[PDB]
């Protein structure tokens, strides 16, 4: 039951369902102590039974319970764990992650099959913890706290930060993803090449695997962190290593519309 | 009494409690029919239950009466002024002891909580709870600075003498315990409650000297 911002409280529906059960349970105790007739007691027990059902699963038996002045059914324990929006499919089988970005994709024909164009401003945020250590190592900043304060303001970023950022990402790879990911080649590892702009440059030969054209599509960027994550990406998931289709075994990164026309 | 926070069956059960009390007090000598006297108790119980059980954040019965009276007054003025009254009009109509400030405070008390599962959007795919950050647990950035500071401070205290570092840690609560008063520390070392102050103040100066000559401990001051 939080205090949003600095005004108004926000509460879950489980509080309302618990309160109803406690109110009816306490009332039943009072009625029993007063020797009320059987008609009154029988009604109270039936209400108490219905209060438990709504708390455990609202709607299974009878009309769903809704909050005052609303027709939106309360969220019970069962509804929390079930459905496309439940705990299993929303927070356990998939999650939101840190060190991730997104931006529009444009075609880069000068890239090699294992390279991609990553904007400088995206790389600065994605690789921030690595960059701060590099700045401290050199003379750019006195310590990590001072280094972090420097990057907060856009006009306080010196030109040596871009040189240090170039050292940090040396050899590393990032994972590019375009939704929907219908096969495994919808997530591939590329070697970033810092570029001026705000759009990601994608190699022409990997467009068919991603099923991505350049009419306004977008892609997500993820950064493996540890050596095990980096080793797997640079060995198994690299774009230049997956050339044949797992489904049929035929080439999947092959000449396309304009390349075929010229040859 | 329906449509006031409590369901129809809840009102009936609250009424039944009032009806049981009426049978206890009803005096048949007076020659008044039962419904004449029993109606008072039934209404009282259905009205008391609403005040005690109609809100997630409970409000005292006396405050509930004040809020309802404020709503009555602020609605009579609306149709009388042909517009929504300002807080000054409501306060003046209420009577003595009421000002514009109090009217606003009473209205900030009568604000119900907003559910965390109210959808936002045409589809039932987004909710309020998806947009409320957690500001209690320390963030990874804040945790790192706390550990870094302890590491830098620990080395700084390594330049001092062994007892002075223990004096500062004890007096400053670096041992996870509240700051032990000079005396309490004096009993720890069996010395006066003034000697601890003299060494503690002296050592605190030397730490000041080193930081100025190194400036390796100022970025943590925020």
């Amino acid at each position: 039951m939080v205090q949003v911002d600095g005004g108004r409280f926000a509460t879950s529906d489980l509080n309302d369902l618990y309160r109803r059960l406690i109110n009816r349970n306490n009332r039943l105790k009072k009625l029993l102590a007063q020797g009320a007739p059987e008609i009154i007691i029988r009604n109270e027990k039936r209400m108490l039974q219905e209060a438990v059902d709504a708390l455990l699963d609202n709607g299974r038996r009878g009309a769903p319970v809704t909050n005052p002045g609303s027709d939106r059914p309360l969220r019970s324990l069962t509804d929390i764990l079930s459905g496309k929006q439940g705990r299993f499919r929303q927070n356990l089988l998939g999650k939101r992650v840190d060190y991730s970005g997104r931006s529009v994709i444009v075609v880069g024909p000068q890239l090699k099959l294992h390279q991609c164009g990553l904007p400088k401003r995206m790389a600065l945020e994605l690789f921030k913890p690595f960059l701060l250590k590099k700045m401290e190592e050199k003379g750019i900043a006195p310590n990590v706290k001072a280094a972090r304060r420097m990057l907060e303001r856009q006009r306080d970023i010196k030109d040596e930060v871009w040189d240090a950022l170039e050292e940090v990402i040396h050899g590393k790879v990032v994972l590019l993803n375009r939704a929907p990911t219908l096969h495994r080649l919808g997530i591939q590892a590329f070697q970033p090449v810092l570029v001026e702009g705000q759009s990601i440059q994608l190699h022409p030969l990997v467009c068919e695997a991603f099923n991505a054209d350049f009419d306004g599509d977008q892609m997500a960027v993820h950064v493996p962190l540890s050596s095990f994550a980096q080793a797997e990406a640079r060995i198994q998931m690299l774009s230049a290593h997956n050339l044949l289709s797992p489904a049929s075994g035929e080439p999947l990164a092959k000449p396309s519309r304009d390349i075929i026309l010229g040859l | 009494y329906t449509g006031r926070g409590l369901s129809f069956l809840d009102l009936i059960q609250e009424g039944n409690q009032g009806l049981i009390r009426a049978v206890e007090k009803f005096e048949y000598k007076r020659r008044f029919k039962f419904s004449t006297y029993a109606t008072w108790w039934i209404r009282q119980a259905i009205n008391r239950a609403i005040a005690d059980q109609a809100r997630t954040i409970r409000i005292p019965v006396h405050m509930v009466e004040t809020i309802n009276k404020l709503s009555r007054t602020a609605r009579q003025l609306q149709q009388e002024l042909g517009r929504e009254p300002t807080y000054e009009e409501i306060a003046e109509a209420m009577g003595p002891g009421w000002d514009a400030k109090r009217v606003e405070e009473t209205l900030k008390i009568a604000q119900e909580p907003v559910s965390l599962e109210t959808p936002i959007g045409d589809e039932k795919d987004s909710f309020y709870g998806d947009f409320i950050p957690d500001e209690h647990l320390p963030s990874p950035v804040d945790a790192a600075t706390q550990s870094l500071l302890s590491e830098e401070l620990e080395k700084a205290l390594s330049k001092l003498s062994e007892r002075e570092a223990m004096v500062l840690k004890l007096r400053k609560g670096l041992i996870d315990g509240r700051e032990h008063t000079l005396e309490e520390v004096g009993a720890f070392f069996g010395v006066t409650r003034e000697r601890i102050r003299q060494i503690e103040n002296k050592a605190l100066r030397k730490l000041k000297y080193h930081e100025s000559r190194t400036r390796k401990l100022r970025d943590f001051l925020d």
Binding site: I39, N43, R46, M47, E50, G62 | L9, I12
Partner: peptide, 14 residues
């Protein structure tokens, strides 16, 4: 049966 209010009203009418 499925309506608690309908069921209660019938009970008190006896």
């Amino acid at each position: 049966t499925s309506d608690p209010v309908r069921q209660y009203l019938h009970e008190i009418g006896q």
